Every structure is written in C-alpha cells, then in structure tokens.
Design a protein around this ligand. Sequence first.
Ligand SMILES: [Mg+2]
Ligand SMILES: [Mg+2]
Ligand SMILES: [Mg+2]
Ligand SMILES: [Mg+2]
Ligand SMILES: [Mg+2]
Ligand SMILES: [Mg+2]
Ligand SMILES: [Mg+2]
Ligand SMILES: [Mg+2]
Ligand SMILES: [Mg+2]
Ligand SMILES: [Mg+2]
Ligand SMILES: [Mg+2]
Ligand SMILES: [Mg+2]
Ligand SMILES: [Mg+2]
Ligand SMILES: [Mg+2]
Ligand SMILES: [Mg+2]
Ligand SMILES: [Mg+2]
Lengths: 109, 41, 93, 55, 115, 85, 116, 95, 101
Amino acid sequence: KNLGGKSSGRRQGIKKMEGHYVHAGNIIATQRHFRWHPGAHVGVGKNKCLYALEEGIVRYTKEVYVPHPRNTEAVDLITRLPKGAVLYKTFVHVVPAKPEGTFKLVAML
Amino acid sequence: ARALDLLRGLPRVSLANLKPNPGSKKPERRPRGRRRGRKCG
Amino acid sequence: GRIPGRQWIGKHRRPRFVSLRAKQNMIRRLEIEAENHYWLSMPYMTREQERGHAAVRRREAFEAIKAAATSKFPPHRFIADQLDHLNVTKKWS
Amino acid sequence: KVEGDIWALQKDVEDFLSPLLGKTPVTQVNEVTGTLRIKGYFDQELKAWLLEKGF
Amino acid sequence: KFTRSRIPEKVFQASPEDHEKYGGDPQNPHKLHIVTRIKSTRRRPYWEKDIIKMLGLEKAHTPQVHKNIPSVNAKLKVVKHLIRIKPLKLPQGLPAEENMSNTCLKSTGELVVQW
Amino acid sequence: GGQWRLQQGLAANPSGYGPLTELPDWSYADGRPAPPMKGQLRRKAERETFARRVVLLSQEMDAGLQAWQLRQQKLQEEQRKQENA
Amino acid sequence: LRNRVTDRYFRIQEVLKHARHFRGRKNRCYRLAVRTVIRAFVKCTKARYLKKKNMRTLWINRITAASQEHGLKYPALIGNLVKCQVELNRKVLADLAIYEPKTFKSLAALASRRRH
Amino acid sequence: LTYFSARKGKRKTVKAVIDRFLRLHCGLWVRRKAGYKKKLWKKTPARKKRLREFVFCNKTQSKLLDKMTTSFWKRRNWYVDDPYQKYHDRTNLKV
Amino acid sequence: RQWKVTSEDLILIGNELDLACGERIRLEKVLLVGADNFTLLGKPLLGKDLVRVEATVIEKTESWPRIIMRFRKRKNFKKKRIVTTPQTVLRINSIEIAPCL
RNA sequence: ACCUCGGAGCAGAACCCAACCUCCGAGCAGUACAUGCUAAGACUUCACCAGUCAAAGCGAACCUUUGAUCCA
RNA sequence: CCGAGCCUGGUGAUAGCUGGUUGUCCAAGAUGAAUCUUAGUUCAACUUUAAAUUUGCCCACAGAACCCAAAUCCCCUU
RNA sequence: GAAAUUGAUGGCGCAAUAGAUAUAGUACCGCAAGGGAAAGAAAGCAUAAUAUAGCAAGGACUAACCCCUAUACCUUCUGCAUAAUGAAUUAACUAGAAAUAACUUUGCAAGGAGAGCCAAAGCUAAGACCCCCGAAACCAGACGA
Ligand SMILES: [Mg+2]
Ligand SMILES: [Mg+2]
Ligand SMILES: [Mg+2]
Ligand SMILES: [Mg+2]
Ligand SMILES: [Mg+2]
Ligand SMILES: [Mg+2]
Ligand SMILES: [Mg+2]
Ligand SMILES: [Mg+2]
Ligand SMILES: [Mg+2]
Ligand SMILES: [Mg+2]
Ligand SMILES: [Mg+2]
Ligand SMILES: [Mg+2]
Ligand SMILES: [Mg+2]
Ligand SMILES: [Mg+2]
Ligand SMILES: [Mg+2]
Ligand SMILES: [Mg+2]
C-alpha cells in the first residue's frame, strides 16, 4: 500500500571543504535549505547553492545572523529572543588569492 | 661503411639467411593449449 | 549426537571451548601489544619539529620516479645484430 | 636520412638539446635504418641546427 | 558497522610503572623504532594492509627501522596489533662509514658495530 | 627452545645470526680462505643497507631538530630586531 | 587432411611410460592413464613436504626412545641440550641414538645434569 | 551495421548517425541537445539556452560514431564558408 | 645441515660448491667429535685447534629430474615443470684431533 | 496491487546506499510577460540521455515536476 | 512416430537455451543505470596492454546545521 | 543503395574415415517422391586368476603388499567426492573465419600511393584480432488413399 519513495539521493552537500582552492564560479556547496550561509565573495543561486564569486581559498566561520528586515518571519523570530541572545550561523567565505590586476609599463612615450 | 665490411666478413646472403625485422611480425594467437584454449577467450 | 545444519555457521553450532593454550597465546599477544603501546607513547620529535624535515629527500625520490617514468623509450637497434643472423649458414669449407 | 656515425650525431643532438630541456633528451638510434628518434617535438630547432651545420 | 578504530590518546600515555617495566626514559626518548610484522595482514582491513605495505613490513619477522616521529607513530598505531616495536639501541653510537659494513642487529635491539 | 636463546640474547633461531651460520663452512686444506658464501654475502649486503638506513634516518631527524631550533631562533631574533626606533 | 598429426604415437607414449606400473587399464588406455599420471605427479610434488615432516617425526620418535632408555623425556633432552649450547639437530641426535649409544648416553647425562 | 555489404563487400555507414551528428576532423563529434524543439513554452530561459547549444560527445560515444561511419565522413572538407572551419582542428592541447 | 661423518664416508651436498673435483677441503664447523671411549662437544662449535675434518670433492653432478606438478580440479589449472638440482659428492678423508683441551 | 517523479525514516555526522519495507505527495497552478540575449566557471541522481547553478557583458527595467527520436 | 503426412529445397533456418571448444610455460586479473528487462545486452565501475608527465594514497590541526553512536569527508607533513 | 564519369595449362590441393556420394547413384532402405553405403594394398585377450585396506597412487623401503599422506576428471554452479551432467575403451576425424581504429616494423615524407584516396606528419606496405553441434518450426514444389 506504500508506493513511491524510490527517489534517489540528490548528491548535495559541500563540494569544497575548508582550505580548498576555488576559482570564480565554482559551486562550493549545494543544500536543500540553508545549512551554510553565503559569506564574503560567495553567491547564492535560485536553489540556495553556494558558488565562489572570486578565485581564492574557502573558509568556514561562525558569525552572528542578522536577517534582511524584509524577511518577516526571521524578524519575528528575532523579536521573540531574550536580550542577551544572539543568533549564529555557519558562513562560507572565499579569501581572494590574486590581486585584481597590476599596473604595467606599456609605452615609454 | 663498416656495415659492408661486416658483410664481407659474414656468410653469403641467401634465401636461407633471411629474417624479418624484429618487431614487424607479431606471433599468431590461436586457441590451443591451457591459456588460449578451453573457452578460447 | 549431531549438530543440525552445517557446523560453525548456523544459529546452532558446535560448542567451541577455549583451551588454556589458546588463553596463553592470546595473553602473549596482548603483552606484546602493551609493550607496543609503551614504545609508541614517547615520540622523539613533535609534529611541528617533524614538519618538513624530510622534504628534500622525498622530493629527490619523486624526481627519480619521474625520471624513470619519462625515460621510457624504445631501445637502440644495431647493424651488428641484424647482420649476425647471417651466421646461421656459417659452415666449414 | 643519416649516414656515417649515427652515434656521433646522437651525441651532438644530446649536447644541443640538453640545455633546452634541462635534461639529456631520451633518444633511440636506429643504426640499421640510419635514423635518430628523440622524445619530444624539436623539429624546428633541429632543422635550424642542421642548417647551421650545413646539411 | 565495522570501521577504523580511534584509539583514545590516554592509551599512549606511559606511566612510571610502565617506564620501570620496559626500561625507556620519557626524557631523551629513543630515536628509531625497530618494527617487525608478527601477524598476517590477511583477514585484516585493506587499510591495515596498506599501512603495512607503506611501512615496508610485507615480510614477517624482518626488522625494519623507522623514525620515532608522530606521523610514523600514527601509522604504527593503526597497525600496532600486527607488529612488535622495540627501540633501536646504539651502544657505540650510529655506525661510522668505516664500519658501516660490520654492523649487526642483536636480538636485544642493539646495533653493534662489531660482528 | 627459542625463548631461552632470546633471554640469553642470542637469536631465537640458531640458524639466525651466530657462529654456526656466519662463519665459513669450509676452507682449502692448505689454509686459504674459501670464497664468501652466497647467503653470507646477501646477509652482509642486507645488514649494510640496514645500517645505512639507520644512519640516514638519525641524521635526517637530527637535522630536522637543528633546523627547527634555527627557525625558532630566527623568529625570536627578528621579532626583537623589529624593536628599532 | 592438409595437416595431420603424425607424432601422436610419441605424445601418447610420453604419458604411458609413467603409467606402465599402474593397475588395470590406467597403465594402457591414455584416457585413463593421463588422469592418474597427473595425480601421481601432483602427489610426488606434494610429498616433498610430508617427507620432511615425517623424517622429523621419525627423528623425534627415535630420540624419545633413546632418551627414555636413560630416564629422560624428549622435551627435557632437547631443552637442556639447548641450554647447554649444544646445537645438535634431531637428525644427528637420532643417528647418534642408533649408532653411538655411548655418545647418546653422554648427551642424556649432560641434559639431566643441566636440568639439575 | 553492415561490416561487409552484399554487393561491394565494403563497410556501410549508419545514415542515422549522419543525419544527427557533425564530425570535426580532429575526432570530435558535435550534436544538438535532445528536446531542444519540444514544449519550449514550459522550459525556463536557462534550460532553453542549454538546449539550444551544440554539444560535444564522449570518447566512447565518439568511438561508436567513428565505428558506425566510414572513412568518407572522416576526411578533410574544404567547404567555402564552413561555420565549423575553425573548430575542425585543436590548438594548445596537452595530451 | 649437520652431517654425522667418519673417515672414508660419502656426503651428498645439494648444491655446487665452486670447487674442482679432487680438490681437498677443510670442514670448519665441527659440532662434535667422538671416539669409542670419549666424545668432545662444542658450545656450539669445537675449536680449530682441536679437530681437523678434511674432505675431497669426488663428484659434481645433477640430481635426477624432479617433477613439480600443480593441478586444481575444475579450473583448467595444470602446470608441469622439471627441475634438476646441482649436487656435489664429498669424501671425508680424515678426522684428526689434537691434545688441545 | 503496482510500473514515472518527489519529500521523510531505514541511511543519526561528506556523498552514496534495497525492499512484497514504514509514511506522505505530484502529474500543475499562481504570477508576470526581460519570467530577455549572451557568457567565465562549476554541480549532476552513481553510465549516457537528460537535469541544475552561475560572475562578467549586452538589453529592458529598478518569478515560486515531469516524456526522447521519428513523424506530422 | 497426424492439433495437421512425407520427401526435396530455401537450409549451414533460427536458438538471449544446453553441450563442446584440441601444444608448453610465465605474468596481470574478482561482485551501479537503462532495458517487452532481470537465463540477455549497452553504458559505467573493475580489469589488461601500451604510452605521456606529475603528483597519488596515508594523513594530524583547522573545517563540514539547524530542526530534532561507531565513524565519515578534507589535507600540511610523514 | 545507384548513376553520370573511368576503362580492363597449372597446384606452399586430397591421398582410401581424405578427395567426388561414388569401386556406385550400385547394394540396401522407402508404396512413391526420395535417402543412400562399405571397401583395395592400439584397445581386447593369451602366455600368466586371486590375498586383509579401500580414486588404487605417492613418500618410501632390503622388500610387491603391509606403514604414512591422499574426497577421480570435465562441465554447470555461491559452493560438487558428491547420491548434479558427460564419458566402456582404442584408433581416426571433429570446433576462432574479418573489419573500423589502434599499436609494432619498414619505405618515402609536406607529401604518400603504380590514376581514384588520404594528408595541419602524413601516407604506403606488412604483422596481430572475431568457433562447433543441436530444435520444435515456416514456406515452395513434388510424392503418397
Ligand atoms: Mg528516499
Ligand atoms: Mg588462464
Ligand atoms: Mg550436517
Ligand atoms: Mg554524473
Ligand atoms: Mg506416418
Ligand atoms: Mg546454430
Ligand atoms: Mg599471478
Ligand atoms: Mg520498451
Ligand atoms: Mg535472456
Ligand atoms: Mg557506371
Ligand atoms: Mg570416400
Ligand atoms: Mg596390446
Ligand atoms: Mg558424477
Ligand atoms: Mg543439468
Ligand atoms: Mg553415462
Ligand atoms: Mg483403397
């Protein structure tokens, strides 16, 4: 009487652990809901996958979570916290490796 | 050349002295014996 | 007096019993390994001291491996080997 | 199309190419066919070198 | 399931009683292990097999000298149930180039430069 | 009875190291020594490699400790040298 | 019949010569002989381990008899000779038991003395 | 396919391959993505863009296609204004 | 191996010795020497000064062909090899003892 | 009775994991009509097919599941 | 020897099914997806050979989630 | 699966189970259509039955047996002494055919090839690689009450 339930796994999770070198555009982690939040130089897709916006080293950190005020449910959740409480989340950052360019001598006019 | 001098020293080249260049003639594999027989690959 | 099924696998197996000899053998092994624990409890260098102390040798060894791998190439061919085959018809005159 | 001391040619080629590679090149001397086979592409360099030698 | 086993660190913390029993000084610890394989790697996990191959202990009862450093010790901890470890003792110091060909490893674990 | 031999410090197996295996089996009746036996030569080569590895490992570990000491000294001396003003 | 085997006689004989001392048709019929000859050769190969195993057992039995003639037990004899640093092996000890009874008596006395 | 035709004794080409795949001389096979003309009204713009693309084949797919076509289809063609003229050869390829 | 030996005895060593036939040799690892009324036991070897056992290389031969046969049922596994081992026959010429006790 | 897809447990912590296994759900709707075009780099349901994400750029503006080929 | 005769021919029918597959010797070599599909096949994985050049495994620290255990992943050294 | 167009006496055979079916389309079989041969110049026994015990042997041994060791082979299976298959035995016969692309070795080389074809080191030549037996059937035409 139990049908369905034959769906395969989504192969989600972290694709780049901490310290892994990541080029711009590489997907860092795919998640179904926000297990890891985007940090510095990390973007978010429609499906909440984290990709590197710059070329660098992936780092995972814990930071205080302050949601966008337009996120009404999160704002209410915060409104219900006690005074000392601060929410925390796991964030993924890309520490950019190369400089974004150098000045070169082109012509000795 | 020294090769022609070696020829001068060696026996006459005939149809009984001829050999293919090594590596040009792979051995033929046929399904007889333990290793190539039975189920014959 | 038979054990149902096949011995040593099923739910009902032949009762196996530990002999004094088996106990002594196991105890001997245990003593060896207790000594192993002791001798593994005193590292000579710390992890930070060992970091990089063999890097040069390891790099040279891998250079040797790479050289062997990249030096693979067909062997030389000599006129002498080809011409020596004429000797199959060497005779006495 | 090498004639003469193919081994002398091999020595010369190794001398000429080792600085470019940084290592002595790996080669095969087909003394029968009179050819020298070098691992890696050096057609342009070897052509220039043979021109300089006057072949 | 069967998995790799994490040995708690307290296992590898010698006590004064152990020091007296085995005759090793925690200060000035020995430099080199002599490791022999005394147990088969058959019926052992592939990771223990691989560790044995790395350490070069494929042949049983053939002593092998290894550094007494934390990484080698980590591997030895993985395969400690297949090996016998004894410190390498150097009564006359390490052999000199002159007598490098006249050494012998006594069963006590001493490398003597006379044989 | 190998345990007793081990206690006395000999090889557990009398066929291991010892006079019975390491000495020449024979010599010429004149007195000239016999050529070394193949097994003895192989065993000597193995022992030489073992000693060479012992020396190499000891030297590598000592050099590593000395290099770490020098690195610590350089770090402390440089951090002190930064105090210049 | 471009190519036909002409040596089959000799190929058969190579096997049959090894079966000529068998019983029944195994010594005549190649189909049967070849199977038994293979078994005979495999047994011959595997018997080199059993030969050594049985010789040592034979030596141990003979040494046990000889030592019991002098009130010793084989374990005591062997262990005490080792402790006295006599490295005579079991083959030689059995040979001495058979052909040099006074020397074996001396060794048994030595083993008992060491034991005491 | 037909390894030996009954009239010539030659190997034949599977024309279903020729109707679907482009072979670049270097050994690459190009193809359209399946469904690139089907029910576009229910496909997101990104999916449509992915589907409208010309795509290379696997090594094993390329080997299969090479087997299924004859050497005529694997020749140099110097067409006048071939859009794939530049793609017919590989550049800066290390191994 | 250990050989129980006496003068005029023959010994079959299962390997070539690198000695010309008829060449005289001294066997140096003598564990035991015995007479009718006394025996001398080494610990484990007697001194060179005590005993001198001498032999002669009488023959250098090959053993009869030994068959190595491997067979496993129902595996098409069958292998045959013939091996001949080198051998040397030594004759023990004399056993001399000296009063060096 | 079921056959495709998806969610949860088995399968606790990267991924992955069956069943006549224990439960649940879907064959689209709402929205707008840039919900356009292009394009680095990636993910990928263990193959392929297919399916995802996406910087930069151009252009307007200021979105949240089902099915191939041929054939018409 | 008739739920559709016999003979010849097509015909060496076809058989994902059963059986068989002949010298010597050495070496490497073992448990997913789709499918009128689960007695089969194709792709993968594994495997073999040859070739190119350069890191591979092991691997501590750091690191990998909220909701509501054994371990695993990742990699400096070694 | 085209066409236009192009134009071009011998035996690394068999030798009486082979080679023709063939000494013969005979003998023989069939009502008939039809099928269709054979052949000419070791095994098995006997000399000489048999001796406790055992995959019939091996290690051996002074000695055949006695002692000790040893669960036929093939195939099919996860796994077979298996009380799963096949085999009385001897002789003879009886089963891996080939392309695409590779690789190896030659030749020549920005060209190769004895027209056509290929070519961004290629082209030309050679070498290596793809089994045997078996249905119930289907259809055509004969032959049979
Ligand atoms: Mg599920
Ligand atoms: Mg095989
Ligand atoms: Mg039972
Ligand atoms: Mg994938
Ligand atoms: Mg009828
Ligand atoms: Mg058939
Ligand atoms: Mg093997
Ligand atoms: Mg279907
Ligand atoms: Mg089937
Ligand atoms: Mg025409
Ligand atoms: Mg005929
Ligand atoms: Mg007869
Ligand atoms: Mg049977
Ligand atoms: Mg059956
Ligand atoms: Mg039968
Ligand atoms: Mg009538």
